[PDB]
Amino acid sequence: ENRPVALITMATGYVGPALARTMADRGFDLVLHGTAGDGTMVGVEESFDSQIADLAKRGADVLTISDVDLTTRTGNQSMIERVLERFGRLDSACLVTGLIVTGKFLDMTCDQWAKVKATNLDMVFHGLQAVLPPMVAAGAGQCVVFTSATGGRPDPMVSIYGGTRAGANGIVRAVGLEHARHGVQVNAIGTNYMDFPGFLKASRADGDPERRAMIEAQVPLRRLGTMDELSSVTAGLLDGSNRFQTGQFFDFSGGWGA
Amino acid sequence: ENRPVALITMATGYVGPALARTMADRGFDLVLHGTAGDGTMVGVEESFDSQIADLAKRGADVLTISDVDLTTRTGNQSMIERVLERFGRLDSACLVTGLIVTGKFLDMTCDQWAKVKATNLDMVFHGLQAVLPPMVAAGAGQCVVFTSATGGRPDPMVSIYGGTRAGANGIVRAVGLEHARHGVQVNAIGTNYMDFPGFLKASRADGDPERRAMIEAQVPLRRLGTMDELSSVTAGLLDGSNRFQTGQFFDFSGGWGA
Amino acid sequence: ENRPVALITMATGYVGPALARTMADRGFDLVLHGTAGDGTMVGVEESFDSQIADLAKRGADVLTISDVDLTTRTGNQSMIERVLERFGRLDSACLVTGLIVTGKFLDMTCDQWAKVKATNLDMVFHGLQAVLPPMVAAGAGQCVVFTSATGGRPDPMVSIYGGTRAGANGIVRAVGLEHARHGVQVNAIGTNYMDFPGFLKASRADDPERRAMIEAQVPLRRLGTMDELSSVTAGLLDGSNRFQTGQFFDFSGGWGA
Amino acid sequence: ENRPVALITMATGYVGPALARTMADRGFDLVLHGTAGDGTMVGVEESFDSQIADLAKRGADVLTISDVDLTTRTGNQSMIERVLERFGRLDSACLVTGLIVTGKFLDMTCDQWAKVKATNLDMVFHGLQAVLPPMVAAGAGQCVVFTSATGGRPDPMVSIYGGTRAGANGIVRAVGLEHARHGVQVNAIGTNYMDFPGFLKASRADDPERRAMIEAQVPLRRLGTMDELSSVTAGLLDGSNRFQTGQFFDFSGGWGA
Ligand SMILES: *C1=CC(=O)N(CCN2C(=O)C=CC2=O)C1=O
Ligand SMILES: *C1=CC(=O)N(CCN2C(=O)C=CC2=O)C1=O
């Protein structure tokens, strides 16, 4: 048929898997970027193989990509070329970016500063510069850049991480408005306090019911957000249902960033 | 059998009709407040009688209410009283509020100041004071207060209207955070440049396609928003699929308020 | 000497007294609205009579106004009429507005709602509609409206107070932009954690242990002084800065950053 | 006597010259970083030499620095090393950062992206990492980082410039809150539509019709002067205001309101 194509990076963890499932139910074809290997590999919460079988049952064709560095121009340009080759179209793109670094500002090394710029900014710059040309040509496109809820409140101990996330949102706003007249939407979603293996291990909430209660007590809604909730909101900005929002940052942290 | 209940005010125009259809598709019973009469009556784009026919097809019981002053405590208290009588529960509420007024700040009469304070603030204060107790008791609830996109950018010629909309969003942020510990979400949507007869006639664009073209020229996405899109976004905050957002204001103006 | 004139409401308390002194030192004539009486009167931290003696020493004429209700159109229209009489000009206006109310949102009575709308909004609407025509005509004016730092972050327990302070800031933004082409600036300043009898008595700090707990909530770990707030406020009213209009400035030690 | 010390980078242009004068008048010793040479050298609107004469008249000792790369850790660490050598103390710092780049987002080369990351961010990260340790040990300090008014509204055609300026403000907010604890304040001032040879030449206004069209985009319908900017900047560095940290102040005549 004429199914549309969604691209989801880091799709072996975080929101990617759940987003891929519902995006398939919306009738999409999927190009998943992620980490190769099985569940025993680090950063692999749902293996590529495990998804392909389930997404096929939803009727989805899936192309997997795992040999690109998304902090560089080449890695992102090569990713989009391999999408347009397999499917000939790019309608939706969900670019998951960033890598967490915390600590005192005066304790930040030059390597931490170089890494946070590469993951929070270079990923967005080269990511958008690669997904926008195919959409501007087709006259229609939808893009969600996944930054961080700290972008709306860069706090102590999160200076260079929150600050660059604030810069990524600012870029998304400018880019979202610059290409609005071509009929493409670029929006940012910043989350925090999400219930997935990454956040659970980072906050030491894994296995400790008390520490998890303490982490939840920091959320106004007194809970951790679920991937199915995030995927639903994310898919709503990438499935063609909403076409009147661009250049905006949506906080998804249970009220923490209100 | 155990179908949640959604309250939608002003449901004879604006997002009400379209929201009622999709909310019924999410499996919700409805209580529609609005203006009684037929299509010829002022402020009735979709009459009551036409909707209960459609909403019953989708499987929704409907209660109609049209004899209340939503700018007063009594009107809103009576609305919720009659909701808890017919269905015995209030899971979601969509409180459309406000009435447009523009002009130079120094030209604003004391009547305009009194009316903008009643439609932009009194409706929100009394509306939220009414719908919140049933949800706090239930330990779960989703509320969307419709203010205006001008609340994010109170501009010249819209001083008192936009300013009080900024206050309504401010109330929504505080209320949304204050009751998040009870499982209740309260969020604000503020639109502009919508495709419905209310804005179409106010912008003098119901006919003149050149005036409509110069109107869409002010929207970054170069078009007017449809009610089917707004109902989709609004339903996402009222159907139980997203329970990790509260106290937040969402712009829906094609990037105008980004 | 054709000295510009500054109007300062609520001037018997809060920033009013300290702002008048510096404003005088910058060569201004003063119109002080405030509560009449002595120090034993409620709401009077620095009595009227005390300020005229000092304000005169700094070389300043002061007109005292105390018989207006600033929540009404007549109260503010009368105040400005009496300014344009004694001095015939209005260059700077500092409109202290608002009145605190806190508590659970669902506990808020209809009277608390009507009062916070009168003090946080009506004072701003009528206060601005009164001071602006005289400046728009002169082609130059500078106005600072005092809202609250809660306007920037309306939090639980301060729903209707902080929410209406947000609306006041919103009004101040549109008004400051709308009349910028006439060369008049309208900006808002919202403070919190100030060191003066008003805040000091409401937080039960007037108990060094409680006061230390108060300041622990401030990022700069201290309370702000009126001399500091007068300086920042006078900077937006002395003509030195004329490139800022329609903006809100948090002044809470970083609490509202 | 113990004259306090203020550091001002890029002091051969922008606010630097005018800020130097008023901060000298406020009883501050100075350390100016800038580009050495005469008025013929690019980027020198007020030559070094012409300044040292004036600040000396206002009673200020001034140490000059022109051999550091402020986008690197070494240049900043050396600049502050030489400040604590000549004067033994750092009380105030005005870190002017950034370099303008505009154009379509999809036309931006990897060199522009690299250059704007270095001028809008690396200058801030290394600037604050250098000036902050001396003030934390002193228990008091005042910093003002100069970003851009585009940080508050990163618009089309200013994608990666305004976006990185927004990240610079985000860092300033976190840093200003993280060290308020130690009695130091870090705040941001982002300007636009200023009357100095830099902006005048970029917008081709140095044509009265283009200048008038430029002032038409400003709500206050005028261009800001360095004497105005220095007043606001000095107020955040002279120890008068000590109740604001981690905040971003727009200074564009209301353009970023
Ligand atoms: C020092 C701080 C910094 O960010 N850089 C640039 C990146 N980098 C390293 O961290 C090591 C070598 C290098 O180029 C500095 O050099
Ligand atoms: C109930 C809530 C409200 O605001 N009002 C109007 C104001 N009012 C009082 O609070 C008491 C008398 C009155 O008019 C309500 O009646």
Automatic annotation (TrEMBL), chains A, B:
UniProt-listed Pfam families: adh_short_C2
Residues annotated as transmembrane: none
Xref: InterPro entries: NAD(P)-bd_dom_sf, SDR, SDR_fam
Gene3D superfamilies in UniProt: NAD(P)-binding Rossmann-like Domain
Domain of life: Bacteria
Family the entry assigns: Belongs to the short-chain dehydrogenases/reductases (SDR) family.
Name of the protein: Putative oxidoreductase
